[PDB]
Amino acid sequence: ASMERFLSVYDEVQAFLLDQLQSKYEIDPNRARYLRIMMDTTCLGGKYFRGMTVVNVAEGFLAVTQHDEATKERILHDACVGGWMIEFLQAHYLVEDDIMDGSVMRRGKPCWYRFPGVTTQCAINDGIILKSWTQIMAWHYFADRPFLKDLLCLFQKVDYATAVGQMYDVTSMCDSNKLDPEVAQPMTTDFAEFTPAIYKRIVKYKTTFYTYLLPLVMGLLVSEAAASVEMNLVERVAHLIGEYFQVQDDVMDCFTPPEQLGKVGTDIEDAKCSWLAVTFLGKANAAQVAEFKANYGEKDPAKVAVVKRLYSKANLQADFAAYEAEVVREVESLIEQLKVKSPTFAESVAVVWEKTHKR
């Protein structure tokens, strides 16, 4: 099975990275063990959706393209390595974002920095190593590949867009005209920047490039199939499915039980520009807006309870149903446009959409 091959390549990449630390970096066995545990804890335990998208896109092309068996194996192995580059990039983001946000739990366990023998002093650097490993993988496994240059260039652009997205996210509750490194930042009082367009910018950059665009395009690159699809359609469909994925995440932060979510959601206390806050402000009357302003962005559980009640009473399920219906309609139109140049790729996009919509 595809998942089995993907998971087997993790063990191979881990062994390569750790053996290289021993043969070239004078690592000792105890530090190699620490890094092995850090890699497992930070990289494993998710659903591997991003990495598996690379594998699925490559499998689709293998079914319609003439290749020797050894070439099919090479392409699948490259798709698995590429998929792990994305999972390790995600691991870097999660480690650093958990430290930045002072998060407590992730994937049902404590955040990496909270492990007793880790601490923030080590975890920041462990996060740096996770991203460095993505490059060591690429240069080693893809050394002689025709797609190495395009892959590294794409990966770097996606990583930069993601870091810019994190900046948009962490500053989304401040007034833009007050941003100033020299002055402590107050929370917005008018919430004028909680709009659909501003929310869409945050999400586009913080999530969609690395969660949807990069796995889809990497699958095309390892398949030598990019100059067969319309890139503007790939970007449009990735940014559309990516926003829906984040909207689902935002709703879950507020209403999915901590055991199912794997953490206690704190977007309200954190004053995040979430889909729920923007949608609520898009339909609230004057008294509801005033009540939201008096309670949002506060740790006090009674204030968080007022916000959750405002959301529940505003029938945000009706807005989500209308948003969902519109996304279903636009994703299906883009898949149709994708069929003009590639039915196989349009099918992988339909799979990606089905796994997102029904998660």
Ligand X SMILES: c1ccc2sc(N3CCN(Cc4c[nH]c5ccccc45)CC3)nc2c1
Contacts with ligand X by CB under 6 A lie at 251, 255, 308-309, 311-312, 316-317, 320
235 is in an annotated binding site: yes
Long-range contact set of residues 278-282: C-beta below 8 Å, sequence gap at least 24: 278/194, 278/195, 278/196, 278/198, 278/199, 279/314, 279/316, 279/319, 279/320, 280/310, 280/311, 280/314, 280/316, 281/191, 281/194, 282/196, 282/319
Known binder of ligand: residue 250? no
CB 349 within 8 A of CB 233: no
Closer residue to ligand X in complex, CB, 10/280: 280
Judged by beta carbon, residue 26 or residue 259, the one nearer its own copies is 26
Total count of residues recorded for the chain: 359
Nearest residue (CB) to its own copies, 63 versus 183: 183
44 CB-near residues (< 8 Å, 6+ apart): 10
Asked if residue 144 belongs to a known ligand binding site, the reply is no
Q: What is the 3-state secondary structure (H, E, C) of 202-250?
A: HHHHHHHHHHHHHHHHHHHHHCCCCCCCCHHHHHHHHHHHHHHHHHHHH
319 lies in the site for Zn ion, by CB under 5 A: no
By CB under 5 A, name the one of 96, 126, 249, 270 that touches Zn ion.
Answer: 249
Q: Which of ligand X, Zn ion, its own copies, none does residue 159 bind (CB under 5 to 8 Å by kind)?
A: its own copies
Q: How far is the CB of 307 from ligand X (least distance, A)?
A: 9
CB of 253 to ligand X, least distance (A): 11
User: 290: Cβ–Cβ under 8 A, 6 or more apart, which residues?
Assistant: none
Choose the one of its own copies, Zn ion, ligand X, none that binds residue 249, judging by a C-beta under 5 to 8 angstroms depending on kind.
Zn ion
Query: Does 267 carry a binding-site annotation?
Result: yes
> Which helix (H) or strand (E) segment is 138 a member of?
helix 119-141
Distance CA 185, CA 200 (A): 23
Residues of this chain that bind its own copies (CB under 8 A): 21, 25-28, 30-31, 33-35, 37-38, 41, 96, 99-102, 115-118, 120-122, 124-126, 128-129, 132-133, 135-136, 139, 149, 152-153, 156, 159-161, 163-164, 166-168, 170-171, 176-185, 201, 204-205
Annotated binding site for Mg(2+): 97, 101, 169, 249, 253
Binding interface with Zn ion (CB under 5 A): 97, 101, 249, 253
